[PDB]
């Protein structure tokens, strides 16, 4: 009946703002789940979740907040070399989704990463394996 | 006059992962729309369109001088109908938001944009496990 949402928090090891073979996971990371409504454009509820092993965070949504606009936001990191939240120009990197499932099956959300201060030196090797021009904005 | 170029890449998200993987494939001839703004809610300073050459790489021209302008790059067209779906994040179309402060005669590289291939490919589950991550379904 309820909604099970799963997600992971990685340390963006290479400052790629996505997840590579060099990325590492963060347990004890801060994550905010927030939802809005259509009839008001307003809030509906807010819950804070924390990541366990493999950076997995989990949250159970009762169906009183059924099918509403929801976005996730990074809050805290267990790790000071990876304490920076990468902004995309002028916005915090949200992770928008809408609250729906069938057969009650868990919905796994895309991951979110914290930026490291010093990019690893083996990163040019990684972007080269994915054959992309390394981002430097 | 100044001349400042910002280039990105367009890839076919073969695994429908909303990020680029070892089995992603770039799209040459894809379409990209750039648009800058006075501010977060100001008026647009301009809007240009570029297309991707080899390796899905597109080069955008900034003929002017611009500082602290609110720009974002959006997907426009694909040259491959096997990979033409633009992914949705629940209710917004994705974009590359950045603030423009040009410097003459140089190039800045931004993050890639992906088109969704309708059928994932048969060992995409194995790439997610290479990365130690649970396969997303959003
Ligand atoms: Ni409630």
UniProtKB/Swiss-Prot annotation, chain A:
Keywords: Allergen, Disulfide bond, Glycoprotein, Secreted. Its main location: secreted. It is found in: Secreted. GO terms for cellular component: extracellular space. The keyword Secreted applies. Glycans are attached at residue 103. It comes from the Eukaryota. It holds the Pfam family Pollen_Ole_e_1. Transmembrane segments: none annotated. Coiled coil: none annotated. Belongs to the Ole e I family. This is Major pollen allergen Lig v 1. It comes from Ligustrum vulgare (Common privet).
């Amino acid at each position: 009946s309820q909604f099970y949402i799963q997600g992971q928090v990685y340390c963006d090891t290479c400052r790629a703002r996505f997840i590579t073979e060099l990325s590492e996971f963060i347990p004890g990371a801060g994550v905010r789940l927030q939802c809005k409504d259509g009839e008001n454009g307003k809030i509906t509820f807010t819950e804070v979740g924390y990541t366990r092993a493999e950076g997995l965070y989990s949250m159970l949504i009762e169906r009183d907040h059924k099918n509403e606009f929801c976005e996730i936001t990074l809050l805290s990191s267990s790790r000071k070399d990876c304490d920076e939240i990468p902004i995309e120009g002028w916005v915090k990197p949200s992770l928008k989704f809408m609250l729906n499932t069938v057969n009650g099956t868990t919905r796994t959300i895309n991951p979110l990463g914290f930026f490291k201060k010093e990019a690893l030196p083996k990163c040019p090797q990684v972007f080269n394996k994915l054959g992309m021009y390394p981002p430097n904005m």
